[PDB]
């Protein structure tokens, strides 16, 4: 059974403007495993991105963690872009520290 991905965007540590942090994008619960995940800076693909191994559980289906180093700023800018066969077009989820 096909499952659209669950996407969670958050920082590793509490966000403080001007201080180095890590922007996380956790994608889980999707099937099949073919997926596209990118971290964005005003829609621009961030190129220095790391990611965990593609893992699978019988309960969570497939999951995957992307993360990059970033420095939060006053403005709203950072987001995650996920593309999947269950999506007609790439889905962008903006980062919100109050969320």
């Amino acid at each position, epitope marked *: 059974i096909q499952r659209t991905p669950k996407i969670q965007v958050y920082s590793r540590h509490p966000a403080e403007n001007g201080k180095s942090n890590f922007l996380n994008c956790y994608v889980s619960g999707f099937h099949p495993s073919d997926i596209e995940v*990118d971290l964005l800076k*005003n829609g621009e693909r961030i190129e220095k991105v790391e990611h965990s191994d593609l893992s699978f559980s019988k309960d969570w289906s497939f999951y995957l963690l992307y993360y990059t180093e970033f420095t939060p700023t006053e403005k709203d800018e950072y987001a995650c872009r996920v593309n999947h066969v269950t999506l007609s077009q790439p889905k962008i989820v903006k980062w919100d520290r109050d969320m």
Partner: antibody
Amino acid sequence: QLQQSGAELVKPGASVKLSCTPSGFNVKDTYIHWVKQRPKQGLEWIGRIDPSDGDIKYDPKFQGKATITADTSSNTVSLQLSSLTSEDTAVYYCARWFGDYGAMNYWGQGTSVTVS
Amino acid sequence: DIQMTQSPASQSASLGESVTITCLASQTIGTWLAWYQQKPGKSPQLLIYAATSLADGVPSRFSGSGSGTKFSLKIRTLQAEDFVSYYCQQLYSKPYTFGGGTKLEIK
């Protein structure tokens, strides 16, 4: 709308500065790209600037020739071309980035630069 | 630097016919690909973003397809305004290189 400055006709070896001024939004709101197009030839990506934090990226082959700047006090992004030769004769477009698209959705009319 | 091999370089067709333009990336770029159209006397204009999504105002006879390294631009039922230039562009890794372009000519 992305207003661009008037056409330029200059001698070889001179310098020129093309300006790109948006109407309806601030330069600090998005990325401004610059594209070169020789007469009857294809498109060439030069670089782009984030005027909100001054991040600039260039195509490596344009680093010695082109210099992108921003005057946020005047809501203007500029592209400077120096030591002009015949190969620099082209139309230079400035394009506005749209994050939800992941591409440049609106382009300016372009500034024609003629090197005699 | 990522290379984009756009083919064909030139194509001729008649009104109503269909055309397919292909762009090949030198490495996987996912769906970070845009298609632009350039008409005589105009700036380039966005047709397709994210490989398959139409921009506002673009007619439904324009179709984008592909993922990874091979991408396609399909134009059905060609009218006079469509016989212009088309360029693909990768937005995966800077520099955001363009394709060589394709000029559509009438019969």
